[PDB]
Design a protein around this nucleic acid. Structure first.
Ligand SMILES: [Mg+2]
Ligand SMILES: [Mg+2]
Ligand code: NA
Length: 316
DNA sequence: AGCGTCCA
DNA sequence: GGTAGACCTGGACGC
DNA sequence: GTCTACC
């Protein structure tokens, strides 16, 4: 298929969004375990599926440049303002990150030192279905392997979009695509391990027991506490996966996912121990306490602060 | 040399 | 509710 | 990281 585009080579096909590097660093956000569907197919150019279409993104110092491959056999053209609005919404650019960074660093000198090096780590606003099933795949696993699982999931069950170079892009699967009684065994052949049952069972649960796709909108509109509790009914979704979905797709900025990294960070960088449990190792109680600790430290956007330290810890 | 343990 | 241990997969890497 | 089984 046609080539992945670069900004310098095809400038007619790109349009810009005002966005300084202090507000966004694509190389620190897109491969850091929020979305698993972006790839740096050319140096400094990131390609992936965003609102049912393939996009490539690249930055200059003050602008985010975007290009869209529409693949309806239409003539190539730069993104329209309406199309760019989807990219603006995905990166939540109405939130001003430099002001959050000032607050987090003011209350936390360790955060301040990390943030000096890791500018522009913000939170994507993801589709709830893509986020739910990607994070069901993430538990007790590593980002490289999760990325391959999500890719093969989309390849097998999501609609084909377009081919660029040797890469065939697919949309994320629907609930209905993942709900069949044959889907689990297929996802096992695709190497999802014991999470194959969780993906298929969770799709069935949403369709058969929760009212379908509208339930995720209910949870978007619900409090953090109510959305967090409700998600945990799903097979494979415990408190960490539920917090990932709350933070990254249901607009709960205070949700703080607590994984192996955040636990290591708490111990190493904060010398933290739980005070609501005599036993100090990970447990339902101590994981709950740690998320409350980070919220008390960083404030209402504590989950966004978590994403900064998580991105940095993947690099260290 | 590559098995087998650690780890995400 | 607290606790312990099993668990798919496959890269890192000590021995 | 979540599940299941046992206290
Ligand atoms: Mg054309
Ligand atoms: Mg559950
Ligand atoms: Na420090």
């Amino acid at each position: 298929g046609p080539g992945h585009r670069t900004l310098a080579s095809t400038p007619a096909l790109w349009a810009s969004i005002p966005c300084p590097r202090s507000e966004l660093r694509l190389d620190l956000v897109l491969p850091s375990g929020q979305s698993f569907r972006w790839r740096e197919q050319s140096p400094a150019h990131w390609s992936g599926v965003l609102a049912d279409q393939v996009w490539t993104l690249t930055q200059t110092e003050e602008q985010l440049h975007c290009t869209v491959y529409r693949g309806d056999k239409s003539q190539a053209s730069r993104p329209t303002p309406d199309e760019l609005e989807a990219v603006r919404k995905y990166f939540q650019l109405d939130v001003t990150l430099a002001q959050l960074y000032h607050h987090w660093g003011s209350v936390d000198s360790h955060f301040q030192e990390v943030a000096q090096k890791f500018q522009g780590v913000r939170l994507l606003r993801q589709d709830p279905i893509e986020c739910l099933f990607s994070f069901i795949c993430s538990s007790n696993n590593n980002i490289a392997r999760i990325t391959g699982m999500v890719e093969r999931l989309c390849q097998a069950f999501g609609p084909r979009l377009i081919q660029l170079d040797d890469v065939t892009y697919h949309g994320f699967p629907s609930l209905q695509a993942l709900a069949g009684p044959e889907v689990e065994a297929h996802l096992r052949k695709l190497g999802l391990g014991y999470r194959a049952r969780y993906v298929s069972a969770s799709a069935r649960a949403i369709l058969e027991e929760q009212g379908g796709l509208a339930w995720l909108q209910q949870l978007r509109e619900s409090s953090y506490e109510e959305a967090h509790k409700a998600l945990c009914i799903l097979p494979g979704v415990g408190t960490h996966v539920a917090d990932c979905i709350c933070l990254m797709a249901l607009d709960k900025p205070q949700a703080v996912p607590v994984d192996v990294h955040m636990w290591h960070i708490a111990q190493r960088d904060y010398s933290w121990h739980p005070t609501t449990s005599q036993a100090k190792g990970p447990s339902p109680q101590t994981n709950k306490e740690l998320g409350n600790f980070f919220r008390s430290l960083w404030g209402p956007y504590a989950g966004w602060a978590q994403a900064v330290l998580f991105s940095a810890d993947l690099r260290q």
